[PDB]
């Protein structure tokens, strides 16, 4: 129930200009990324996953491919997550929540470079407008960072009486969003807050997981007229930057993707805040999604190789001859 798929960037300029060469080769049909080793020229080893995406993949193609089936299964009622992993600056903000195209020329809700976080949320009302019923929709915002909670809308964990595999974070701002016009509106407040933050802000985020969660509340009524209510959520998880200190959020939520993989008995969730808050959306029924994201610069060979060891090792699958 667990599927890693890669992203691999463009070039970028300091890459350009830092003289780098170009180390990766992706093939989506093959679902392999192979890499240059050796500085040599032969030297060079190959992975699989459940996809690839190279360098001129759309926003607009990771959101089909990889969220629309999982947000079809939290609208049937389940959690799930989807998280953004690898070397700062690879682009794992840019695929989460995106962009928009300069000088206004697109609406959030069609703009190319829009990512995960709205085009979900533009979908969620899509789907359940075109569906009949009754609905509602809240979304919340925090921040992972040495291990301490911040609200990013607007903290205090303790395990939920209600829910043996849930927390309730005492503080934590929940927003109702009524329409997508509320839905431009924060994410237009978002962007601001982006492009205004200073350097220090940014590298902060840098080294920290931003979880947005969205919460959907769906009302039926039996032929009787009894009311009934069912919840999904889904987790967006922008993670802490993967470059080498230790993340003890990073290496517990590892730990348990590991536990789960492997079916370990022991799954452990209680070692880090980041994974008692995902606790209630990760093993079960349930789909979840590692977008592990990479540079294809030379300059990155290392912690590129990192990311990719890792997410092979997450999923495992065999070269295919
Ligand atoms: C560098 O420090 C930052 C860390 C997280 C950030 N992410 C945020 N902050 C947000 C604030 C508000 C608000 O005030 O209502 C709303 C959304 C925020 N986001 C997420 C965000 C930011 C830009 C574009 C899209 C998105 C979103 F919502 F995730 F899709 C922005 C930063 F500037
Ligand atoms: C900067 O500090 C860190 C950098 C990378 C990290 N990445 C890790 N550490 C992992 C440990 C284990 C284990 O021991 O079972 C397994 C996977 C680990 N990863 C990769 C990771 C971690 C969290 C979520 C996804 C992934 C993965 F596999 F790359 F997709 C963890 C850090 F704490
Ligand atoms: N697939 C891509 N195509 C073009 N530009 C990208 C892509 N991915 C990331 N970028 C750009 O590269 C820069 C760094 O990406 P960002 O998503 O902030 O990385 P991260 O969150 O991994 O540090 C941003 O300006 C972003 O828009
Ligand atoms: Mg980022």
Redesign the pocket.
């Known amino acids: 129930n667990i599927q890693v798929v890669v ?1 691999c ?2 070039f ?1 300029l300091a890459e350009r200009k830092a003289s780098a060469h170009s180390i990766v080769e992706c093939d989506p049909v093959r679902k392999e990324v192979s890499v240059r080793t050796g500085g040599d020229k032969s030297s060079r080893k190959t992975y699989t996953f459940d996809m690839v995406f190279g ?1 001129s ?1 759309k926003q607009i193609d990771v959101y089909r491919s990889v969220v629309c089936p999982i947000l079809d299964e939290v609208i049937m009622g389940y959690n799930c997550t989807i998280f ?1 992993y ?10 989460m929540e995106g ?1 928009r195209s300069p000088n206004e020329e697109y609406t959030w809700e069609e703009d190319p470079l829009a990512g995960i976080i709205p085009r979900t949320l533009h979908q969620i009302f899509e789907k359940l407008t075109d569906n009949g019923t009754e609905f509602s929709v809240k979304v919340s915002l925090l921040e992972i960072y040495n291990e301490e909670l911040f609200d990013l809308l607007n903290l205090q964990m303790f395990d939920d009486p209600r829910n043996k595999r849930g927390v309730i974070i005492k503080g934590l701002e929940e927003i109702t969003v009524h329409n997508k016009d509320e839905v431009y509106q924060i994410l237009e407040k978002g962007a601001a807050k982006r492009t205004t933050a200073a350097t220090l802000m940014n590298a902060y985020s ?1 080294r920290s997981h931003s979880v947005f969660s969205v919460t959907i509340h769906m009302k039926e009524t039996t032929i009787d007229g009894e009311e009934l209510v069912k919840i999904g959520k889904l987790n967006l998880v ?1 993670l802490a ?1 993967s470059e080498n200190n230790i993340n003890q959020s990073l290496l517990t939520l590892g730990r348990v993707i590991t536990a789960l993989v492997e079916r370990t008995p022991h799954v452990p969730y209680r070692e880090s805040k980041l994974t008692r808050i995902l606790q209630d959306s990760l093993g079960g029924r349930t789909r979840t999604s590692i977008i592990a ?1 990479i540079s294809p610069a030379s300059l990155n060979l290392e912690e590129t190789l990192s990311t990719l060891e890792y997410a092979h090792r997450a999923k495992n699958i065999l070269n295919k001859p």
């Open positions: 992203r960037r463009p970028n360098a993949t953004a690898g070397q700062t600056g690879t682009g794992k903000t840019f695929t962009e840098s922008d930057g994201t």
